Design a protein around this ligand. Sequence first.
Ligand SMILES: C[S@@+](CC[C@H](N)C(=O)[O-])C[C@H]1O[C@@H](n2cnc3c(N)ncnc32)[C@H](O)[C@@H]1O
Ligand code: NA
Length: 402
Amino acid sequence: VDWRDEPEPSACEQVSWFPECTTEIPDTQEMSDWMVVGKRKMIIEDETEFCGEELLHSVLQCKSVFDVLDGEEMRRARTRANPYEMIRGVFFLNRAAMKMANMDFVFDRMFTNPRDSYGKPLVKDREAELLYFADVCAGPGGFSEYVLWRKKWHAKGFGMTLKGPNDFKLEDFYSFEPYYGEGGIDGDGDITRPENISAFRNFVLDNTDRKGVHFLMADGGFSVEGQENLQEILSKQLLLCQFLMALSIVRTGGHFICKTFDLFTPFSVGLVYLLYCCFERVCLFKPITSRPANSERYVVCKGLKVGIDDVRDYLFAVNIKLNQLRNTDSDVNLVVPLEVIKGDHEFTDYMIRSNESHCSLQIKALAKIHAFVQDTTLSEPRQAEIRKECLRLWGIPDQARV
Ligand SMILES: C[S@@+](CC[C@H](N)C(=O)[O-])C[C@H]1O[C@@H](n2cnc3c(N)ncnc32)[C@H](O)[C@@H]1O
Ligand code: NA
């Protein structure tokens, strides 16, 4: 694998969108046969419905190269190999915060300055109007810190995240109501329990005139140490519930941004297909603040449509089933038929092209880290200058925490 003739790194990033959906939103009747249960499949190597075999097998093999290497040694090389590494978190509580700073710029401030379908801003700060947002799978809270810092005032947020070591750290915010699923501070904050979903949903609706938030951010993940290649499969329920939460609390015309990992499986692509039916426009995007060797990307959904209740209730039901099937030999493996997805040739084309381009880049980034492990003299000379250019472009002042 040759990573060495890759283009120069740059603060300039390109976005590609799914074409606008041209079909009706599916109703309950249409979806009645869509949920397929089968044996639990802890196998990723044959998942080629939306990606060529050679690319899939290559990315798996480039990850597995690291099975024998000490973690810190790999990370030290990663630090040197990533052109965008030095951005870090700037003055925010973590580097995750700068992923939202990055993407709020790239998507034309659609999150901090949301507009109606005709382009007119919805929130008038001069009139003291409130921007309402939500943040789930979200502790310690960088994404929210960013939103609150950009707005300075007149931004009301609602959050839900697991208790414990990765809970919100509101005290660490540079410049907001966490909710755990039972009222006040009570509950475990688990987005996969149906009662927590419903409770958070009512909490947010009751506090937004029953309309919902201008937008929802979701950034779910957890440790997959020792089973890294299975990440997508291991995080399938979390992906579903975040998508479900978007259809549950985002107001009409509102937006949704959510972290995913690999999107090779029919389960994952079928979920993305549902978002694409439910929103005016959808994109898959990996910001340069997301490290280049990993499977992370973001699905960005603009302009939620009217009439999405049947899809919402469908996903609510699929989640209940996923919970029923935990620790059994079965699982939900499809949520939209493959023949339906691939029947949409425009969708499928974008999907394959997205998966393959991400794989191509990730393969190079992984091979590069391996090279940097073996030769500690290799370097990315323009890290500081690239950092400076990104902050300037994104409107992020170069200042530190006191
Ligand atoms: C990568 S972090 C989020 C970082 C956040 N965007 C920020 O900027 O600080 C993932 C978060 O999702 C949480 N999470 C994982 N599983 C969850 C679940 N089932 N319910 C609610 N939160 C969950 C984790 O505990 C963690 O806080
Ligand atoms: Na990252």
